[PDB]
Each structure stands twice: as structure tokens, then as C-alpha cells.
Design a protein around this ligand. Structure first.
Ligand SMILES: *[C@@H]1O[C@H](CO)[C@@H](O[C@@H]2O[C@H](CO)[C@@H](O[C@@H]3O[C@H](CO)[C@@H](O)[C@H](O)[C@@H]3O)[C@H](O)[C@H]2NC(C)=O)[C@H](O)[C@H]1NC(C)=O
Ligand SMILES: *[C@@H]1O[C@H](CO)[C@@H](O[C@@H]2O[C@H](CO)[C@@H](O)[C@H](O)[C@H]2NC(C)=O)[C@H](O)[C@H]1NC(C)=O
Ligand SMILES: *[C@@H]1O[C@H](CO)[C@@H](O[C@@H]2O[C@H](CO)[C@@H](O)[C@H](O)[C@H]2NC(C)=O)[C@H](O)[C@H]1NC(C)=O
Ligand SMILES: *[C@@H]1O[C@H](CO)[C@@H](O[C@@H]2O[C@H](CO)[C@@H](O)[C@H](O)[C@H]2NC(C)=O)[C@H](O)[C@H]1NC(C)=O
Ligand SMILES: *[C@@H]1O[C@H](CO)[C@@H](O[C@@H]2O[C@H](CO)[C@@H](O)[C@H](O)[C@H]2NC(C)=O)[C@H](O)[C@H]1NC(C)=O
Ligand code: NAG
Lengths: 367, 376, 49
């Protein structure tokens, strides 16, 4: 029918990580042919050169798809090599503003949700701390809205400001009674910024934080024990829900019979089932795939596309299922669609659920 | 017969710049040696295309590359050049950092702009920026806004599908018809500036009471005559001083060339990008001349190889070439040309301009060390 | 009209009466958004069947 093994390339920035373990777990669950046969390379995801080398090497070796991670410095090469060669890249990484159909973004976009939450608390003047690494398009979106609703935003790039730069602006903030801060960035850099913020903010009274992140619960929230700080964020995964819990139970036993999964690891988990589903849809559609092990060379002019790449791409895009991250679904541009984000709040370990956000209803709360 | 090969990476429409480059090759050529350019025309925003063209020129064994980059391809250029010790000489925007092996012909504009804004004593203003072109100078004024006590309204003018354009630009100004914005910084390519100027006029906002600052280095590159009589203040910056004999003597020549042989070159003015390109040919010529005056042999013995050879071991003479390029000090169309150790223009001058009923007039000048100086 | 526009006298506060019988024979679109009043006469009624 089809080949018995479907080789899948991988572009991972680390030799070991929770994502890796998520990836391997999801794969050992699968039972039906085709067998997804992973072939990954540890690579500096920030270097276009290394990235070009790996991509071409995997393309040459004959993989049917590439699963991996990219950074702001590599999105253009990937989008470009994916578009030119019709090989799909399935990634949990921070979603980009303009990419192509061939790139499949497991991570739901956050920017609309974030604007809702600001509009909710009727913020007017606030600090926006961001990741120069992913959020150059989001800021403009924030600056755009600011023009419309006449906000007074203060942009601060994480990569470029110093300890003293920070001291200084937290010195500006504490001149006024309520200090409003948005922090949009990835988890590892997030935690590093936390320790720097808490120490600067003292009693934490009058400080209100919105963390533009999908793993609110992944954060070390102990850094906020007896901080007056009002902290709001977003959780993508509920581990007590039926499907999620069943899944958590399954690999919890998997590792005991033999730690709480971060959202990127959850996305990695669901990214694998996306791929599994994609090809099993190709088997029942009975479309026949096959690729050259004969090192079909990568660079050329023009780029000669993989003739059946569009088949694998349509399949990946049409995937619909219930995974660790709720409803897994893509619009035609390659992005997560039909998803719900849960909004959470914390004060003196106040773990309350403000409500939820989705594309159709936006934000609905829940003498 | 002394052919030193170089590359030229030219954006697919940079006609005048290429004409300027070909002219400089003639002006500065000598019996000592002949720069022998190999030219690629490419989609400069396409990083794949840019890598292909760089690697193609590297394999040929060029001794340096003159060229252009985009905000999307700048990293390809700096990484590949920095890794392989291949010097890139460019009139493009200066890099945001101290990347080596990159000779940046174009002076920094942020200082002069910040200085000009203070000069007019502005505190509240609109900043029209073009995401296509970059946010770097917006950021500098956003950083400064607190200390300098400004209220900046930043509007992105950069994703306009030419389909509408007219409608968008009118909507933008009829929106600045909210916060009563009358002080406006442009910060766009000369074309986008022209488009916007055209719409300001159609909307009738080129009258007294509005003031525009064109934040590029070519105040008189575009058509100012059409916005000259409305009454609005219009200020800008100029790096090519047509009052200099060197420039005047150049334009005497340039205005004469056959337009068929030199597209873009049968004119009275010349885009500052083309002027920086002409200047680049002088710098490259001097650098390689000076390497001989010091009997530094830089001739490659074996093939440069593949830009994707592994390991990446840069050739020994790259550093010498870089240094020679960075040690060049000449006077050109863009004034005194000098570089620091990171290839950024130093000791340069930017003229400050206002538009008057009798045309653009120089009102002063901005220097690295003197900042803003009113002329009299 | 072309020169009034170039001079910036097609704004609010000016009013022009075009004294011919073909108000819409020429190009009015270009002086439409300045704010000036512009009035004229028309004998060909394009609303007639
Ligand atoms: C992975 O590859 C990327 C290249 O794509 C390397 O990025 C380069 O990273 C270095 C170290 O972080 C950056 O240098 C640092 O720059 C700062 C700011 O100028 C400077 O103050 C520091 O002294 C240091 O030089 C470098 O700028 C960056 N290059 C580019 C083009 O962005 C990365 O280092 C590689 N990492 C590993 C572990 O291999
Ligand atoms: C977290 O801080 C926010 C910030 O105000 C609080 O949310 C407000 O709740 C009050 C009281 O019901 C409402 O009147 C407002 O609608 C909310 N204001 C804003 C600006 O969002 C919230 O009460 C805080 N959480 C805790 C546990 O104290
Ligand atoms: C939005 O996504 C949800 C998934 O939760 C879809 O709702 C399911 O639709 C299926 C297919 O008809 C039904 O069998 C289920 O009962 C629905 N489940 C739930 C939980 O509501 C929904 O169809 C999607 N909407 C769009 C427009 O794609
Ligand atoms: C246009 O330029 C002038 C001169 O720089 C601006 O200021 C004029 O000169 C003095 C100095 O402040 C003011 O007292 C006058 O009121 C200004 N002249 C007039 C007639 O306005 C002037 O403000 C500028 N226009 C704008 C909108 O910035
Ligand atoms: C342009 O047209 C208007 C209406 O015919 C002129 O008069 C306006 O309407 C009333 C009637 O006299 C005046 O009280 C208003 O002051 C006018 N409106 C405005 C905003 O000016 C108006 O004078 C005409 N313009 C000229 C220069 O004749
Ligand atoms: C997950 O469901 C539990 C069900 O009781 C609910 O308490 C919680 O609010 C839900 N999720 C989030 C992210 O808050």
C-alpha cells in the first residue's frame, strides 16, 4: 500500500530534555503502520547555516517530514526551504506572523488573547517586556492597538536591557500606585526574569503582572510566596481533564513501572499524533508515497520540489483530534485553529480561574 | 594585467546604483591594478538567494564583496562574512552591533535625528515607521522618549498593499485627526516618502501648522518642489553636499552620461545610495592600493573552495584586507570618509535642511562630536 | 482649478462658482476634498432615462 516505515527528521536544540522524552513516549504508543521512524539531529536551532546543513542532509536522506524547533534567527530559512522544497516542518515553537502552508505550528497564537486580557482590565499605561527572539511582530501588534485605544505602552526588549536598565524602569514604575507589567517570553528566559523582578519589587503591593505564556502552571510560582503581586496568565493544558489525565496516567506508569509535563512537551506529544494521524489519513485515502534514499541533492536553481510533498501537507493540515492540548486543528495557513485558552490568576497563591478565551467569543469570565 | 577580483551583489532594481558603481570603476581605475567586478543581480530580501550569491562569489575567489542587504538577509551577510573573513562593503543600513568584516559606507542617522527633534523643541509627535525597512531608529527615539520627555505616537506605514494605498494613507492622517497631531516624522525609503507626501498634499495637510521631518539621508533625492508652497515646515538630512567642488565636478560629468548606457544617470541630483556606491569604489581601490604600498601580499594561492566546507577555516589574509579597508581615509561624494574598528563611518557630517519657497536650504550640520550646529 | 489647488486655496473658507453650463463636464474629483464650496450649473441631467 505505502512504505512500512515513514522516516521523520528532527531538529532538536538539546541532547536531552523533556521534549525529547515526550517525543519518544508518543512514538512508543503508536501501533498501526506506517511506523514513524525518527532520525534526529542535535543542532543549534539559532544558526541558519547549521540549520541549512541538517535540513538538506535530512532532505537528502529521504525523510517525509521534519519535526523540530526554530528561533527568530532561523524562521526565514525554514519557511524558505520548506516552501521551496515542499517538505513540512511540524514545530511547537513560537508562531510567526507570515510563514507558509508547509510549516505546521502546534503552538496556538497568543496575541489576540493577550489584547483581550488588557482590554478586560481596562489598562491604559503599562510596561511591555518581550523576547527579541520571537516577539518583534507581536509588539507592533501591541503598538497598533495602543494607537487605537490610546494606550501609553513602554517597550522593553529582554535581550538588550541590563540589570540597571531594569532597576531604573522599576524605579519609574513605583512612582505611581498601580504598576502594570506585561511579560511575553518563553519559559526558560521567563524564570530568569522572575527572580530579577521579585527582588526589585519589594512588598509587591500594587503590582499587576500578565505573563504572555501558555504554561502558567509551569512557572516557579514560589518566587511569589507572600508577594502582593497580582499575576495573570494562560494555561493550555488541564491535567485533570479526561483525555489529558488518561494520557498523564499512561506515561506516569510508563516511567514508574520502568515531573509535570511542560506545555512544549505537551505540544511535542500532540505533534507526534498529528504526524501519525496525517500518514494514516494517507493510507485510507490510498495515496502512494515513496522517496529517494539516493541522496536527491538539496540546493539547486530552481529548487525542485518533492512532488508528493503537497499530499503530506494537505493531510497534516486536515488533522482533527483531541490531544494533551485540547482540540488539535489547523487553518489553511498552517496555524492552530478552534482552540480554547484558559485564563488563570494568582495572589498569595491565589490559583483562581478567571475564565477562558477562544477565537469566536474572545474572553468570557467564569458596611 | 593586475586583476583583483571582487563581487558585486546588486538588488534586482538598483539601476542608478549600478550606474554609479560603473562610473566609480572608471574614475578610480589605474595602471597599478584593475578591480575586476563579478556582478550578481538578486532578490536581496531572499536569504536563500543571498547565500547562493555569496557562496557563488566566494567560490570564484573574490577578494571582497561590494553589495546590499535587507533587514531579512543582513544576518546571512554578517555571519558568512564574519565566519569566512570576507569583507563586505555596503551602502545599506549600518548593522545593529559590531559585526566584523563589514564596511558600512552609510553613516548613522539616529544621533542627528534625535538632535533635530530636540532642536525644534518637540515634546509630542507622530512617528511614521516602515516595518519593511526596520524599526532600529524608532527604537532609539522610543528609548530616549522618557529622558527627553516626549510623547510619541508610532504608526506602522509598512504593510500597505499598493491596491489601496491612497485610502490607507488618507485614513492614517484622518486618524491623526484625533489627537491633533501636526508634528510628524517620516523615516521611510524615498519612494514611500513621495507616496506619503502625495497624500498629505491631496488631504491638504501641507499647510502652515504642520511640520514634517524626513528621516533619511537624502532630503533632496526626491521631489520637494510639490510640497514647497503649502506653508508646512519640512526638514531633513543630506550627506551629499552639492556645494562641494568634488561633488559639483562629479555631477557635471554625471549629468552628461548617456541615459541608455547609464540608467538613472542623466540628472542633476543623485540618490545618496548611489553616491555611497561610487564612494565605495574609491575605498576599495585605496584599500587594495595601500596593501601594495605596504608589500602585504594578499593573492590567494589555492581555490577559496566551498562556502560550506567543513571545518570552516578562514583564509589568512582576510584580516589584512579588512584592516586595510577600515584604515582608508578619503574625501568623496558623501564627504570625509573614515571608519572605526567596526567599520562604521566616523568623523562624518550630516547637513540639516529645511524646505523654503526658494527651495531646500542648509540650516546647519550635525557632527559626531559637535552634535547639532546652526549655520551662519 | 489646478492652480487654486497648488496654491492651497481649495480649502474651507473659499467658495467658487463655475459659470458655465457643464458643471460636471470637467474633473471635479481633484478639488472635492479640500473643503472649499464649489457650485455650478448643469443642463444635461444624467438622471433622465
Ligand atoms: C548558535 O548559533 C548562533 C549563530 O546563529 C550563535 O549566535 C551568536 O551568538 C553569540 C553568542 O550569544 C552572539 O554574540 C554575543 O553578541 C552579544 C551582543 O552583540 C555580544 O555582546 C556578546 O559579546 C556575544 O558576542 C552573536 O551575536 C550571535 N550571532 C548572530 C548572527 O546573532 C550562537 O552563539 C550559537 N550558539 C552555540 C552554543 O553554538
Ligand atoms: C487581581 O487583580 C485584579 C486587578 O484589579 C483584580 O480584578 C478586579 O476585581 C475587582 C473586584 O471584583 C473588579 O471590580 C475588577 O473588575 C477587576 N479589575 C481589573 C482592573 O481587572 C482581582 O480582584 C485580583 N485578584 C485577587 C485575588 O485579589
Ligand atoms: C470546534 O472544535 C470542536 C472540537 O471541540 C468541534 O466540536 C466537535 O465537533 C464534532 C464533529 O461534529 C462533534 O462530534 C463533537 O460533539 C464536538 N465536540 C465538542 C466538544 O463541542 C467543532 O465542530 C469545531 N468547530 C469548527 C468551526 O471547526
Ligand atoms: C514651523 O517653524 C517655526 C520656526 O521653527 C515654528 O515656530 C515659529 O517660530 C517661533 C519659535 O517658537 C514661534 O513662536 C512661532 O509661533 C512659530 N511661527 C509660526 C508662525 O507658527 C513653528 O511652530 C513650526 N510649525 C510647527 C507646526 O511646528
Ligand atoms: C460655504 O457654504 C456654507 C453654506 O452655504 C456657507 O455658510 C455656512 O452656513 C451658515 C449660513 O450662513 C453660516 O452661518 C456658517 O458659518 C457657514 N458654515 C461654515 C462652517 O462656514 C459658508 O460661508 C460658505 N463658505 C464661503 C466662504 O462662502
Ligand atoms: C481544568 O478543569 C478543572 C476542572 O474542575 C478546572 O478546575 C480548571 O479551572 C480547568 N482548567 C484551568 C486551566 O483552569
Amino acid at each position: 500500500n505505502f512504505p512500512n516505515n515513514i522516516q521523520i527528521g528532527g531538529l532538536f536544540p538539546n541532547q536531552q530534555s523533556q521534549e525529547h522524552a515526550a517525543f519518544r513516549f508518543a512514538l512508543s504508543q503508536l501501533t498501526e503502520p506506517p511506523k514513524l521512524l525518527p532520525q534526529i539531529d542535535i543542532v543549534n536551532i539559532s544558526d541558519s547555516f547549521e540549520m541549512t546543513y541538517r535540513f538538506c542532509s535530512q532532505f537528502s536522506k529521504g525523510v517525509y517530514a521534519i519535526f523540530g524547533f526554530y528561533e527568530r534567527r532561523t524562521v526565514n530559512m525554514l519557511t524558505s526551504f520548506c516552501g521551496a522544497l515542499h517538505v513540512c516542518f511540524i514545530t511547537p515553537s513560537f508562531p510567526v506572523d507570515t510563514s507558509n502552508q508547509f510549516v505546521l505550528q502546534l503552538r496556538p497564537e497568543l496575541q489576540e488573547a493577550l489584547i483581550s486580557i488588557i482590554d478586560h482590565y481596562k489598562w491604559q499605561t503599562f510596561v511591555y517586556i518581550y523576547d527579541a527572539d520571537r516577539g518583534l511582530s507581536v509588539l507592533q501588534r501591541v503598538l497598533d492597538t495602543a494607537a487605537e485605544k490610546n494606550w501609553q505602552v513602554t517597550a522593553v526588549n529582554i535581550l538588550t536591557t541590563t540589570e540597571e536598565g531594569y532597576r531604573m524602569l522599576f524605579q519609574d514604575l513605583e512612582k505611581k500606585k498601580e504598576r502594570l507589567v506585561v511579560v511575553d517570553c518563553e519559559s526558560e528566559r521567563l524564570n530568569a526574569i522572575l527572580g530579577q523582578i521579585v527582588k526589585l519589587e519589594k512588598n509587591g503591593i500594587g503590582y499587576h503582572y500578565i505573563l504572555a505564556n501558555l504554561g502558567f502552571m509551569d512557572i516557579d510560582l514560589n518566587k511569589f510566596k507572600e508577594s502582593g503581586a497580582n499575576v495573570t496568565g494562560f494555561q493550555l493544558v488541564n491535567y485533570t481533564d479526561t483525555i489529558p489525565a488518561r494520557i498523564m496516567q499512561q506515561w506516569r506508569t510508563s516511567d514508574s513501572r520502568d515531573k509535570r509535563p511542560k506545555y512544549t512537551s505537551a505540544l511535542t506529544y500532540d505533534g507526534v499524533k498529528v504526524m501519525a494521524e496525517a500518514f494514516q489519513s494517507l493510507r485510507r485515502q490510498r495515496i502512494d508515497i515513496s522517496r529517494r534514499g539516493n541522496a536527491g541533492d538539496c540546493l539547486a536553481n530552481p529548487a525542485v520540489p518533492w512532488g508528493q510533498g503537497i499530499d503530506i501537507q494537505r493531510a497534516l493540515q486536515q488533522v482533527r483530534f483531541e490531544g494533551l492540548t485540547g482540540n488539535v486543528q489547523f487553518n489553511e495557513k498552517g496555524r492552530r485553529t478552534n482552540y480554547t485558552l484558559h485564563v488563570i490568576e494568582m495572589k498569595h497563591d491565589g490559583i483562581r480561574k478567571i475564565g477562558y478565551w477562544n477565537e469566536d467569543d474572545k474572553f468570557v469570565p467564569a458596611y | 594585467s593586475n586583476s583583483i577580483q571582487i563581487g558585486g551583489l546588486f538588488p534586482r532594481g538598483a539601476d542608478q546604483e549600478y550606474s554609479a558603481f560603473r562610473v566609480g570603476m572608471v574614475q578610480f581605475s589605474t595602471s597599478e591594478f584593475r578591480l575586476t567586478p563579478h556582478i550578481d543581480n538578486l532578490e536581496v530580501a531572499n536569504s536563500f538567494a543571498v547565500t547562493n550569491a555569496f557562496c557563488s562569489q566566494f567560490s570564484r575567489g573574490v577578494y571582497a564583496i561590494f553589495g546590499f542587504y535587507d533587514k531579512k538577509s543582513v544576518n546571512t551577510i554578517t555571519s558568512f562574512c564574519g565566519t569566512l573573513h570576507v569583507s563586505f562593503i555596503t551602502p545599506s543600513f549600518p548593522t545593529d552591533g559590531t559585526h566584523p568584516f563589514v564596511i558600512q559606507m552609510r553613516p548613522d542617522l539616529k544621533g542627528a535625528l534625535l538632535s533635530l527633534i530636540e532642536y525644534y523643541q518637540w515634546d509630542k509627535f507622530a512617528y511614521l515607521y516602515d516595518s519593511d525597512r526596520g524599526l532600529s531608529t524608532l527604537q532609539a527615539v522610543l528609548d530616549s522618549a522618557a529622558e527627553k520627555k516626549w510623547q510619541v505616537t508610532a504608526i506602522n506605514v509598512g504593510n500597505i498593499n499598493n491596491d489601496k494605498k491612497d485610502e490607507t494613507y488618507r485614513s492614517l492622517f484622518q486618524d491623526l485627526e484625533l489627537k491633533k497631531e501636526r508634528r510628524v516624522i517620516l523615516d521611510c525609503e524615498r519612494d514611500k516618502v513621495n507616496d506619503i507626501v502625495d497624500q498629505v498634499i491631496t488631504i491638504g495637510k501641507h499647510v502652515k501648522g504642520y511640520h514634517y521631518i524626513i528621516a533619511n539621508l537624502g532630503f533632496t533625492d526626491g521631489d520637494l518642489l510639490k510640497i514647497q508652497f503649502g506653508g508646512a515646515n519640512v526638514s531633513g538630512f543630506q550627506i551629499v553636499d552639492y556645494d562641494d567642488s568634488l561633488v559639483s565636478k562629479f555631477i557635471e560629468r554625471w549629468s552628461t552620461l548617456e541615459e541608455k548606457e547609464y540608467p538613472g544617470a542623466h540628472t542633476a541630483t543623485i540618490k545618496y545610495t548611489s553616491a555611497l556606491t561610487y564612494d565605495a569604489v574609491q575605498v576599495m581601490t585605496e584599500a587594495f592600493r595601500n596593501l601594495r604600498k605596504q608589500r602585504i601580499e594578499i593573492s590567494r594561492r589555492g581555490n577559496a573552495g566551498d562556502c560550506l566546507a567543513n571545518p570552516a577555516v578562514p583564509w589568512g589574509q582576510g584580516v589584512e584586507i579588512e584592516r586595510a579597508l577600515k584604515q582608508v581615509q578619503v574625501e568623496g561624494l558623501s564627504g570625509n570618509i573614515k571608519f572605526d574598528q567596526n567599520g562604521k563611518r566616523i568623523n562624518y557630517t550630516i547637513n540639516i535642511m529645511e524646505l523654503k519657497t526658494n527651495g531646500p536650504r542648509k540650516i546647519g550640520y550635525w557632527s559626531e562630536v559637535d552634535k547639532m550646529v546652526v549655520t551662519l
